[PDB]
């Protein structure tokens, strides 16, 4: 009933954000015939909304060292980060940012002409003992905008075959290998099968599983959901980052660069309350700590506004010229969406879903991995990078300005790994004559759905269930109440209701597909959250307040009884889903503690985590 | 000329500034010098200005050539008739002043 | 205390043979809706008519997806306040003088291709040290990019220009032209003369007649018309 | 891997042979005084040129010289107000186009491009046009 157009490339990239673009023209740069499949015009991707900047130990403000940045990221990750990936990311960061500037990225400038860098949350000098670092390189507070527009501009020089407004439905799997993807062309309504020896999944996050989020409407975790439908695991999905200062009401992001430039958080009694929660770092502590600090203030009666449900972010003590030069983007946004003049009145803010630490598990080379009987096994022909991937460089909590860096480092890395492992023009692997037909059947059933609950009604019940049961603080009885509700919503997807029976630009259909994608991501999130009986990074259990490592790392390790791998929690969560039932399966895999070179960059053993 | 488009844009403004200064010259120093300068400037400015109209609104190889050809005839006839009026009649400056004495 | 607002929206379905463009009317209780037009489009689509089709993503005015003609002017539906005067119906159209894929979704591929044509990326004569060291740029030369780099390629300006209406095949339009200027005056670019030389024809640049609809309509408050005028001054003074 | 020129051709090739409509434009777009004053600058320019060309054609084809047709008009003894009304109608287009032409040449130097300055200079053009035309027609 549907026409199918078959393509053959050396490689296929799914996503056109910062990470997909870097990978896609990286692959063409290396001679590969590359296809870039994206459901958005590339510069509409959520990367364009990024503000604060991108971290690199350039030393433009003070003497820096990329290993200090390594330490901050490991400590920030709460020792759920893989230290070999963090090593690669943080050592490559100066060259990554310099590449972007050489591409033409219009970085702000210092008196010496070099890239301006601002302070940002939880970044220090001298391995934590030397005070505040200034290594977040930025284009005012429009950094992601400039990064994405520079990469897109750069991409136009190469022979990459773009497939814009194409909606990937599923991977094309054969004998445990990935041979490409199947996608819907939204413009003319045709089904396209992309065959390639290598596929790179760079589909962004899935923040829209929640009611309030800074994420775009298009952040529905489409690539996370294809992996899950392929039978592969997703990693650490229960670690959702709550940014401290999402604007009250609209949830739009107000950058942490506000606090990097001098802004401070104030409660209903005018106390810079971060002086009590983090006496050292204050409003520049890690985001999981700040969001918890703000949330604790609100449920204890010290909330602001008429409803006592948010707090304030004060900037008017800073000079208006600094606010105009360093923060012009959020000055406009605060006026448009909250009527606030940032030179006179504070911004209403509250913790808001912002970024997904979890995602598709990879190694430090970008290659997607699975776990069989205690060993990692690379999936042949399948790669992931960006917020859709779990390298894992961010572990249990991401430092601000490390995501944009993640994008270009591991986007390039996927291109480098394919180029050293394979050659262009090598045989394009064959597929079955009816490969991907299940993707078409599912799309056609949704296209003509005529049940009793429209897509919009089901998307809401999911977002309110996530918001009430997996918020900044979590307990077992609330997480389990939300597990049964969410698994009930998934079973109720059988009674979905659409109206648009067309196939050209059927956003009714596409958003139904995105709801399926969101639901797979949300179940893995809340079920992995319920089983994790500890508190690490953004995941806070009030019925398990302590961090449970393989040792008690507060007291000397001398003669300690080491906890077996099944009796502690310093380990990644691996989640699987039986798509028909919705049943979630959980396993675990160890955290990689070794660096790429211990003589060049010492491994950081777990320690107490305070800011 | 590889700079032909920008040279034409500059020339259009140069003739406009010149036509602008001919108006006070025509009021201050009416005579044959201004009469023939006005005839030349009025035609060139009008010819180029009507060509921008054609460039904006006429499309297709043949309609464009028909329009520009008829414009060129219109302008050549216009410049000739103005020079005729200046040589055989009272000229541009005098005609204006006579018209306003009604 | 409901306040019922009326919207009238352009509709065309390419999957319905013989379908003709019409204007459908919806009634929205502003007491149960966000403040912006896009919030009304989304509420209409979720609750009243799931077939209403339009482009959106960021909902904060940064990605450019949701450009359209609202109350007669090209704007972003997500930064455009709903007119609370219940005695006036808001009319919503696609970007003007564009092929309609469906409902509010225009075809922008010519606009994208024109942007590709001006090579919008940093170019140096010697690109052998690409990636070695950060290029230097004074605070002053970087300030010259303010007002230029912030463009979000929404196409509100170009689709408001009558010259782009009549000669969109050959006139590059104010969005693309201002991006050409953003690279011409980047102190790090070595192809200024080459980028000016590209515009030596009657159409690419010189169809602009200073109508200034582009600057009036830009939702980011930018001035492509002044950028075009600065290009024209450079065209007239550069020596090969 | 298509070039920009190739993409342009494919755009036109597929849209003109499609069933897609063209989004409305003139019938729906909101008017403004700058847009109206730009249309009026073209109307007055075209009208002046067509008048200049009709004059030169009359000079080549009419069997009587200019002073004859002036004496004819003077002998009709038309009213002062109608003479004034005819003089206003002839000088208004030249007046508008001249002042707004100066505005254009100011723009071509790169001055006055702030949207609020565009509106100021336009209203100034309107009152100078009206003051100059009433002054000149009264002559
Ligand atoms: C939300 C946000 C995030 C953010 C930020 C500000 C905001 C408002 N500021 C940041 C900052 O200052 N510094 C930083 O390090 N990070 C910041 N972030 C986080 C970061 O921006 C994002 O996590 C990151 O940009 C994600 O980039 P990525 O390339 O991984 O993904 P994306 O940009 O969201 O784009 C997703 C792409 O995938 C394509 N896609 C998705 N589904 C499909 C299907 N089904 N078919 C085809 N293509 C698909 C989309 O087209 C999109 O291009
Ligand atoms: C549609 C229009 C189509 C035609 C387009 C015309 C474009 C060309 C314009 C040429 C301008 C030439 C200016 C001539 C200057 C001149 O010699 O004018 C003298 C005239 C006498 O004035 P004066 O003696 O001071 O009398 C005062 C009142 N008793 O002083 C005047 O009365 C000046 C009157 C100027 C009115 C111009 C109107 C042109 C129509
Ligand atoms: C006697 C005059 C005649 C017959 C005349 C005729 C014209 C015509 C036909 C146009 C083209 C209209 C368009 O392209 O929109 C034009 C444009 C123009 N005129 Fe005149 N004009 C006269 C006097 C003047 C004066 C005194 C000035 C000063 C002037 C300045 C301009 C300018 C700057 C333009 C450019 C319009 C643009 O850039 O789009 N003109 N004129
Ligand atoms: C012969 C004389 C020839 C010229 C006469 C032209 C007469 C027609 C003018 C039509 C003007 O139409 C009207 O213009 C005004 C002023 O620009 C517009 O005004 C709008 O833009 C201005 C400028 O930023 C804003 O300050 C103002 O608050 C807003 O309402 C209004 O939206 C439009 O409805
Ligand atoms: N200025 C303008 C314009 C022109 O042709 C125009 C004028 C002067 C110079 C060059 C041009 Cl190209 C037009 N404007 C409109 C219009 C009508 C209704 C609503 C909005 C715009 C139709 S033509
Ligand atoms: C000042 C005199 C203006 C005369 C305009 C005459 C009508 C033009 O006609 C129109 O021109 C448009 C392009 O401009 C085309 O898009 C239309 O298809 C065509 O019908
Ligand atoms: O998430 C990040 O990396 C940074 C961010 O949102 C900000 O600018 O505040
Ligand atoms: S100049 Fe303004 S209206 Fe035009 S594309 Fe850029 S942001 Fe959009
Ligand atoms: S509206 Fe158009 S004519 Fe020029 S000044 Fe703007 S590009
Ligand atoms: S949705 Fe991104 S600009 Fe309106
Ligand atoms: K991730």
From B96, B35, B34, select the one nearest D136 (Cα to Cα): B96
Whether residue A68 contacts residue A126, with contact meaning beta carbons closer than 8 Å, is answered with yes
Atom of ligand 7 minimally distant from the CA of A355: 1
**Residue C31 DSSP class:** G
Class of residue A564 by CB neighbours under 10 A (exposed 0-12, middle 13-18, buried 19+): exposed
Q: Which residues contact A99 (CB under 8 A, 6 or more apart)?
A: A408, C130, C131
First to last CA, chain B: 50
Whether C132 has its CB under 8 Å from any CB of chain A: the answer is yes
> Could you write out the DSSP letters of every residue in A225-291?
HHHHHTT--EE-TT-EEEEEEEETTT--B--THHHHTT-EEE-TT---THHHH-TTTGGGS-HHHHH
- What the block records as the tokens of C231 is 């290009």
Class of residue A429 by CB neighbours under 10 A (exposed 0-12, middle 13-18, buried 19+): middle
Whether residue C10 contacts residue C93, with contact meaning beta carbons closer than 8 Å, is answered with yes
Residue whose CA is at the smallest distance from ligand 8 atom 2: C218
Give the per-residue SS3 of A117-153. Answer: EEEEEEEECCCCCCCEEEEEECCCCCHHHHHHHHHHH
List domains and CATH numbers for chain B.
1-102 (1.20.1300.10)
**Residue A474 DSSP class:** B
Whether residue A131 contacts residue A125, with contact meaning beta carbons closer than 8 Å, is answered with yes
- What the block records as the tokens of A213 is 């989020």
Do D79 and D17 lie in one domain? The reply is no
Measured CA to CA, the distance from residue A163 to residue A181 in angstroms comes to: 13
From C190, C208, C195, C182, select the one nearest C235 (Cα to Cα): C195
Q: Which residues contact C217 (CB under 8 A, 6 or more apart)?
A: C73, C74, C75, C156, C157, C160
**Residue A541 DSSP class:** B
- What is the phi/psi pair of residue A453, to 5°? -135, 115
Chain A, window 245-274: residues with a beta carbon less than 8 angstroms from a chain C beta carbon: 250, 252-253
Overall domain count for chain D? 2
Measured CA to CA, the distance from residue A536 to residue A79 in angstroms comes to: 9
Report how this structure was experimentally obtained. X-ray
Whether residue A135 contacts residue A55, with contact meaning beta carbons closer than 8 Å, is answered with yes
Measured CA to CA, the distance from residue A201 to residue A220 in angstroms comes to: 14
Measured CA to CA, the distance from residue A493 to residue D33 in angstroms comes to: 55
Measured CA to CA, the distance from residue A293 to residue A273 in angstroms comes to: 8
In order of A13, A196, A220, A230, A516, the CA distances from A440 in angstroms are 21, 20, 20, 15, 14
Do D24 and D88 lie in one domain? The reply is no
Measured CA to CA, the distance from residue C44 to residue C48 in angstroms comes to: 5
From C86, C117, C97, select the one nearest C3 (Cα to Cα): C86
- What the block records as the tokens of A401 is 């300005």
Resolution to one decimal, Å: 2.2
In order of A235, C197, C205, C232, the CA distances from C240 in angstroms are 59, 9, 19, 16
Q: Chains that contact A by 3+ CB pairs under 8 Å?
A: C, D
Chain D residues within an 8 Å CB radius of C71: 30
Do D81 and D128 lie in one domain? The reply is yes
Strand order of the sheet with strand A117-124? A54-55, A132-137, A117-124
Any catalytic annotation for residue A287? yes
Whether residue A524 contacts residue A575, with contact meaning beta carbons closer than 8 Å, is answered with yes
Among the partner residues A99, A217, A504, nearest to C57 by beta-carbon distance: A217
Residue numbers belonging to the annotated binding site of C: 58, 63, 66, 78, 151, 154, 157, 161, 166, 208, 214, 218
Do D47 and D86 lie in one domain? The reply is yes
> Does the C-beta of A17 come closer than 6 Å to ligand 1?
yes
CATH of the domain at D8: 1.20.5.540
Do D93 and D127 lie in one domain? The reply is yes
Judged by CB atoms closer than 8 Å, whether chains meet at C149 and A146 is answered as yes
- What the block records as the tokens of A308 is 């006592």
What is chain B's length? 102
Which three-class secondary structure state does DSSP give residue C124? coil
Whether residue B67 contacts residue D43, with contact meaning beta carbons closer than 8 Å, is answered with no
Q: Which residues contact C159 (CB under 8 A, 6 or more apart)?
A: C67, C74, C95, C96, C97, C98, C106
Do D7 and D58 lie in one domain? The reply is no
Q: Looking at domain A241-355, which of 1.10.3720.10, 3.30.465.10, 3.90.700.10, 3.40.30.10 is its CATH number? A: 3.90.700.10
Do D71 and D128 lie in one domain? The reply is yes
CA-CA-CA-CA dihedral for D27, D32, D36, D37, to nearest 10 = -160
Measured CA to CA, the distance from residue A393 to residue A82 in angstroms comes to: 6
Whether residue A439 contacts residue A186, with contact meaning beta carbons closer than 8 Å, is answered with no
Whether residue A535 contacts residue A545, with contact meaning beta carbons closer than 8 Å, is answered with yes
Measured CA to CA, the distance from residue A550 to residue A593 in angstroms comes to: 13
Give the per-residue SS3 of A414-435. Answer: HHHHHHHHCCCCCCCCCCCCCC
Cα A529 to chain centroid, rounded: 17
> Does the C-beta of D103 come closer than 6 Å to ligand 3?
no
Do D26 and D36 lie in one domain? The reply is no
Integer-rounded Cα Rg, in Å, for chain C is 21
List domains and CATH numbers for chain C.
1-107 (3.10.20.30), 108-240 (1.10.1060.10)
Judged by CB atoms closer than 8 Å, whether chains meet at C166 and B57 is answered as yes
- What the block records as the tokens of A178 is 């990935």
A177-185 vs C4-11, strand pairing mode: unpaired
The helix/strand count (H/E) of chain D reads as 5, 0
How many interchain CB pairs under 8 A, B with D?
73
From D3, A598, B77, A561, select the one nearest C117 (Cα to Cα): D3
Domain containing residue D108: 32-139
CATH of the domain at D103: 1.20.1300.10
Question: What value, to the nearest 5°, has the Cα angle with vertex A461 and ends A459 and A463?
Answer: 70
Q: Which residues contact D127 (CB under 8 A, 6 or more apart)?
A: none
Q: Which residues contact D68 (CB under 8 A, 6 or more apart)?
A: none
Whether residue A549 contacts residue A606, with contact meaning beta carbons closer than 8 Å, is answered with yes
Do D104 and D115 lie in one domain? The reply is yes
Chain C, window 181-220: residues with a beta carbon less than 8 angstroms from a chain A beta carbon: 183, 186, 188-189
Q: Which residues contact C188 (CB under 8 A, 6 or more apart)?
A: A104, C122, C124, C135, C137
Ligand 1 pocket test, candidate residues A13, A20, A47, most atoms within 8 A of CB: A47
Do D61 and D76 lie in one domain? The reply is yes
From A155, A180, A152, select the one nearest A166 (Cα to Cα): A180
Question: What value, to the nearest 5°, has the Cα angle with vertex B78 and ends D54 and B94?
Answer: 75
């Amino acid at each position: 009933q549907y026409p199918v157009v078959d393509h053959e490339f050396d490689a296929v990239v799914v996503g056109a954000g910062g990470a997909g673009l870097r990978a896609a023209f990286g692959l063409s740069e290396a001679g590969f015939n590359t296809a870039c499949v994206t459901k958005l015009f590339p510069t509409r991707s959520h990367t364009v909304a990024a503000q604060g900047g991108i971290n690199a130990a350039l030393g433009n403000m003070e003497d820096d060292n990329w290993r200090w940045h390594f330490y901050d990221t490991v400590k920030g990750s709460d020792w759920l980060g893989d230290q070999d990936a963090i090593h690669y990311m943080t050592e490559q960061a100066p060259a990554a940012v310099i590449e972007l500037e050489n591409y033409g990225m219009p970085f702000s400038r210092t008196e010496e002409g070099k890239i301006y860098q601002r302070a940002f949350g939880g970044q220090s000098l001298q391995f934590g003992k030397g005070g505040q670092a200034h290594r977040c390189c930025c284009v005012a507070d429009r950094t992601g905008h400039s990064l994405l527009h520079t990469l897109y501009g750069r991409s136009l020089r190469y022979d990459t075959s773009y497939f814009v407004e194409y909606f990937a439905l599923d991977l094309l799997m054969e004998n445990g290998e990935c041979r490409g993807v199947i996608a819907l062309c939204i413009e003319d309504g045709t089904i396209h099968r992309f065959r390639a020896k290598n596929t790179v999944i760079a589909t962004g996050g899935y923040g829209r599983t929640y009611f309030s989020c800074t994420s775009a409407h298009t952040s529905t975790g489409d690539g996370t959901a294809m992996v899950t439908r392929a039978g592969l695991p997703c990693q650490d999905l229960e670690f959702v980052q709550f940014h401290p200062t999402g604007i009250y009401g609209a949830g739009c992001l107000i950058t942490e660069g506000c606090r990097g430039e001098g802004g401070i958080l104030i409660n209903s009694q005018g106390e810079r309350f971060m002086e009590r929660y983090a006496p050292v770092a204050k409003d520049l502590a890690s985001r999981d700590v700040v969001s918890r600090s703000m949330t604790i203030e609100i449920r204890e009666g010290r909330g602001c506004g008429p409803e006592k449900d948010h707090v304030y972010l004060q900037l008017h003590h800073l000079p208006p010229q600094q606010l105009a030069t360093r923060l012009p983007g959020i000055s406009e946004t605060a006026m448009i969406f909250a009527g606030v003049d940032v030179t006179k009145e504070p911004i209403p803010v509250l913790p808001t879903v912002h970024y997904n630490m979890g995602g598709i598990p990879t190694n430090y080379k970008g290659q997607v991995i699975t776990h069989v009987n205690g060993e990692d096994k690379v999936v042949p022909g399948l790669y992931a990078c960006g917020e859709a991937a779990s390298a894992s460089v961010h572990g249990a909590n991401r430092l601000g300005a490390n995501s944009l860096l993640d994008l270009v480092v591991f986007g390039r890395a996927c291109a480098l790994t394919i180029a050293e492992t394979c050659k262009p023009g090598e045989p394009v692997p064959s597929i079955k004559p009816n490969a991907g037909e299940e993707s078409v059947a599912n799309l056609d059933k949704l296209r003509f759905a005529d049940g009793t609950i429209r897509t919009s009604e089901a998307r809401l019940n999911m977002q309110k269930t996530m918001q009430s049961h997996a918020a900044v603080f979590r307990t077992g009885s609330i997480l389990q109440e939300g597990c049964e509700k969410l698994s009930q919503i998934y079973r109720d997807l059988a009674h979905l209701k659409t109206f648009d029976r067309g196939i050209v630009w059927n956003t009714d259909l596409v958003e139904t597909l995105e709801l399926q994608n969101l639901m797979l991501c949300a179940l893995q999130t809340i079920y992995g959250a319920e089983a994790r009986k500890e508190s690490r990074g953004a995941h806070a259990r009030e019925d398990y307040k302590l961090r449970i490592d393989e040792f008690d790392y507060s007291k000397p390790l001398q003669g300690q009884q080491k906890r077996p791998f099944e009796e502690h929690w310093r380990k990644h969560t691996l989640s699987y889903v039986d798509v028909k039932s919705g049943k979630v399966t959980l396993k675990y895999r160890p955290v990689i503690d070794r660096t790429l070179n211990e003589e060049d960059c010492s491994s950081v053993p777990p320690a107490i985590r305070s800011y | 000329s590889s700079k032909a488009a920008s040279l034409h844009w500059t020339s259009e403004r140069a003739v406009s500034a010149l036509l602008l200064g001919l108006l006070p010259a025509a009021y201050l120093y009416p005579g044959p010098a201004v009469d023939y300068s006005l005839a030349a400037a009025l035609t060139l400015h009008g010819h180029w200005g009507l060509g921008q109209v054609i460039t904006d609104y006429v499309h297709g190889d043949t309609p464009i050539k028909v329009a520009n050809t008829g414009l060129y005839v219109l302008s050549a006839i216009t410049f000739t008739g103005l020079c005729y009026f200046n040589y055989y009649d009272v000229g541009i400056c005098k005609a204006v002043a006579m018209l306003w004495s009604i | 205390t409901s306040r019922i607002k009326k919207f009238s929206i352009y509709r065309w379905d390419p999957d319905k043979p013989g379908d003709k463009p019409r204007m459908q009317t919806y009634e929205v209780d502003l007491n149960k809706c966000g403040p912006m037009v896009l919030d009304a489009l989304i509420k209409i689509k979720n609750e009243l008519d799931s077939t209403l089709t339009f482009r959106r993503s960021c909902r904060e005015g940064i990605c450019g997806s949701c450009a359209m003609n609202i109350a007669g002017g090209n704007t972003l539906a997500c930064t455009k306040k709903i007119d609370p005067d219940l005695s006036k119906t808001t009319k919503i159209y696609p970007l003007p003088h564009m092929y309609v894929v469906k409902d509010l979704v225009p075809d922008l591929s010519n606009f994208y291709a024109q942007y590709k044509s001006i090579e919008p990326y940093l170019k140096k004569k010697d690109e052998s040290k690409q990636g070695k060291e950060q290029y230097l740029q004074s605070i002053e030369d970087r300030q010259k990019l303010d007002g230029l780099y912030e463009c979000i390629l929404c196409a509100c300006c170009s689709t408001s220009c009558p010259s782009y209406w009549w000669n969109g095949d050959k006139y590059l339009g104010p969005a693309v032209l201002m991006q050409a200027y953003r690279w011409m005056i980047d102190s790090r670019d070595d192809y200024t003369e080459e980028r000016l030389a590209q515009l030596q024809d009657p159409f690419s640049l010189y169809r602009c007649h200073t109508i200034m609809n582009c600057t009036r309509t830009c939702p980011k408050g930018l001035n492509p018309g002044k950028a075009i005028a600065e290009i024209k001054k450079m065209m007239a003074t550069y020596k090969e | 891997a298509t070039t920009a020129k190739e993409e342009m051709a494919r755009f036109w090739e597929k849209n003109t042979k499609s069933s897609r409509p063209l989004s409305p434009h003139i019938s729906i777009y909101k008017w403004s005084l700058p847009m109206a004053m730009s249309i009026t600058h073209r109307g007055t320019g075209v009208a002046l040129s067509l008048g200049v060309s009709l004059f030169s054609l009359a000079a080549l084809l009419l069997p009587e010289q200019f002073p004859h047709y002036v004496a004819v008009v003077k002998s009709l003894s038309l009213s002062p107000a109608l003479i004034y009304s005819a003089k206003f109608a002839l000088v208004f287009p030249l007046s508008y186009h001249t002042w707004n032409g100066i505005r254009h040449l100011v723009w071509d130097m790169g001055k006055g491009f702030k949207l609020s300055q565009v509106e100021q200079s336009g209203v100034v053009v309107l009152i100078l046009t009206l003051l100059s035309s009433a002054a000149i027609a009264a002559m």
